Chains A and B, each alone.
Chain A
Amino acid sequence: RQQVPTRKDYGSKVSLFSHLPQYSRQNSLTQFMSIPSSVIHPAMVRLGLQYSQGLVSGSNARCIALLRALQQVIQDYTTPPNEELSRDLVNKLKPYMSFLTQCRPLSASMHNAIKFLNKEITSVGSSKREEEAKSELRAAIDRYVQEKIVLAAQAISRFAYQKISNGDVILVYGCSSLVSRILQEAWTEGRRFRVVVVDSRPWLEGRHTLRSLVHAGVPASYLLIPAASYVLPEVSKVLLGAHALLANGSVMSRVGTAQLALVARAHNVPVLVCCETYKFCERVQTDAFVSNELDDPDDLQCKRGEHVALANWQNHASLRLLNLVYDVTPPELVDLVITELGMIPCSSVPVVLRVKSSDQ
Chain B
Amino acid sequence: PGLSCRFYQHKFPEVEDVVMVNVRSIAEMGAYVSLLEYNNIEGMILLSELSRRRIRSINKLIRIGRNECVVVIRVDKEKGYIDLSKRRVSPEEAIKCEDKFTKSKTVYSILRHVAEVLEYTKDEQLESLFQRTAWVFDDKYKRPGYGAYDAFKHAVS
Contact = CB atoms under 8 A, between A and B. Distances in A.
A82 interface: yes
Nearest to A91: B27
Interface string B48-86: 000000001000000000000000000000111100000
Contact of B28 (A83, A84, A118): A118
A86 interface: yes
B29 interface: yes
B80 A82 contact: yes
B147 to A, nearest CB: 34
A122 B29 CA distance: 6
Contact of B81 (A84, A90, A118, A357): A84
A86 B80 contact: no
Contact of B29 (A82, A86, A357): A86
Interface SS majority for chain A: helix
A82 B29 CA distance: 18
A122 B78 CA distance: 20
A150 B78 CA distance: 44
A87 B80 contact: no
Nearest to B81: A84
Contacts of B29: 86-87, 90, 122
Range of interface residues on A (Cβ < 8 Å) = 10 to 19
Contacts of B80: 82
Interface string A81-110: 011101100100000000000000000000
B146 to A, nearest CB: 34
Contacts of A86: 29
> Most chain-A CB neighbours within 10 Å: which of B28, B56, B80?
B28
A84 B81 CA distance: 9
Contacts of B79: 82-84
A119 B81 CA distance: 20
B95 to A, nearest CB: 33
A288 to B, nearest CB: 27
Contacts of B81: 84, 87
A82 B79 CA distance: 5
A122 B28 CA distance: 7
16 contacts: A82-B78, A82-B79, A82-B80, A83-B79, A84-B79, A84-B81, A86-B29, A87-B29, A87-B81, A90-B28, A90-B29, A118-B28, A119-B28, A122-B28, A122-B29, A357-B56
Given A84-B81, A87-B81, 14 more contacts: A82-B78, A82-B79, A82-B80, A83-B79, A84-B79, A86-B29, A87-B29, A90-B28, A90-B29, A118-B28, A119-B28, A122-B28, A122-B29, A357-B56
Interface of A: 82-84, 86-87, 90, 118-119, 122, 357
